[PDB]
Amino acid sequence: MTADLKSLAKRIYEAYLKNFNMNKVKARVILSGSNNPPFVIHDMETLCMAEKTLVAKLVANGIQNKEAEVRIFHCCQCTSVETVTELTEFAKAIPGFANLDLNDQVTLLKYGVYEAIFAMLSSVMNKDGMLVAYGNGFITREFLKSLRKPFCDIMEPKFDFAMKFNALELDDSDISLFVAAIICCGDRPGLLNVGHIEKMQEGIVHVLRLHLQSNHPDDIFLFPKLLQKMADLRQLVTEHAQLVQIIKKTESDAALHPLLQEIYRDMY
Numbered sequence: 001m002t003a004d005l006k007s008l009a010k011r012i013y014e015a016y017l018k019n020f021n022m023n024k025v026k027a028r029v030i031l032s033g034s035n036n037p038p039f040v041i042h043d044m045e046t047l048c049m050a051e052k053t054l055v056a057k058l059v060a061n062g063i064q065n066k067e068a069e070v071r072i073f074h075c076c077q078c079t080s081v082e083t084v085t086e087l088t089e090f091a092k093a094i095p096g097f098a099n100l101d102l103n104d105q106v107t108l109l110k111y112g113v114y115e116a117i118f119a120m121l122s123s124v125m126n127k128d129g130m131l132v133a134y135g136n137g138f139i140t141r142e143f144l145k146s147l148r149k150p151f152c153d154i155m156e157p158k159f160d161f162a163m164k165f166n167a168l169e170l171d172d173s174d175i176s177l178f179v180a181a182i183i184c185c186g187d188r189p190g191l192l193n194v195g196h197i198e199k200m201q202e203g204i205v206h207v208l209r210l211h212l213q214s215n216h217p218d219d220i221f222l223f224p225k226l227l228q229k230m231a232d233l234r235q236l237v238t239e240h241a242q243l244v245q246i247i248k249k250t251e252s253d254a255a256l257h258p259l260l261q262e263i264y265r266d267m268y
């Protein structure tokens with residue numbers, strides 16, 4: 001007559017495998033090097049080749065095509081929009097989330113999605129580049145740094161986060177619970193039922209703590225390491241939103257998708 005925390009951890013893991021198109025095992029298989037291998041984007045020639053195959057509509061406009069950096073930023077946004085959709089369905093697996101008022105579900109997703117995006121991005125990153133386009137491209141870290149300002153400033157802080165996050169050697173069973181804990185933060189601005197959310201947070205963090213104790217017996221400070229990573233992600237998102245606002249004010253061609261504009265509105 002007790003909560004079965006091991007079963008809850010497995011439920012969360014299975015919901016993560018079901019709802020995210022990319023998982024760390026899938027990513028590692030691709031990154032390791034037989035059908036539809038990723039096209040390597042390391043310079044402008046290879047960017048433009050990859051676009052013609054993978055996002056043909058975006059480059060079908062002739063001299064009306066947007067600048068390379070703006071096309072890349074558009075693809076960044078499309079990736080976020082898709083991951084927002086996956087996170088919204090995943091959150092239904094978190095005990096108590098679907099019982100919250102709709103407005104509180106919206107608030108938790110509003111503040112949590114980018115922290116979750118950057119945590120999970122680590123799974124497709126290595127020190128040399130990252131998988132993109134549903135695992136069909138590999139874009140190099142050096143190519144992204146070569147873009148004109150301000151677009152070269154988007155990804156590098158995310159690689160820096162990811163290299164340290166990946167050194168923790170989490171697997172999908174850990175990351176799924178970490179993402180659920182990100183979503184269940186009771187201190188988000190504007191929440192109505194803080195008390196119930198705090199209890200939901202306490203429950204999922206308890207599951208996470210017990211799971212890490214079992215799955216990582218070698219790293220006795222893994223749970224507090226991950227609490228700190230959650231705080232680091234909040235700062236990474238605040239900084240990312242500031243850069244996006246610079247782009248919005250100064251780059252007239254870099255249209256911001258309406259779903260992401262709403263996420264950013266009144267965020268920080």
Ligand SMILES: CCCCCCCCCCCCCCSCC(=O)O
Nearest residue numbers: 050051072075076077079080132133
């Ligand atoms: C041809 C393929 C080119 C692909 C270009 C790279 C795609 C990067 C995906 C990660 C996006 C990071 C999202 C943060 S930037 C946009 C946002 O704020 O949502």
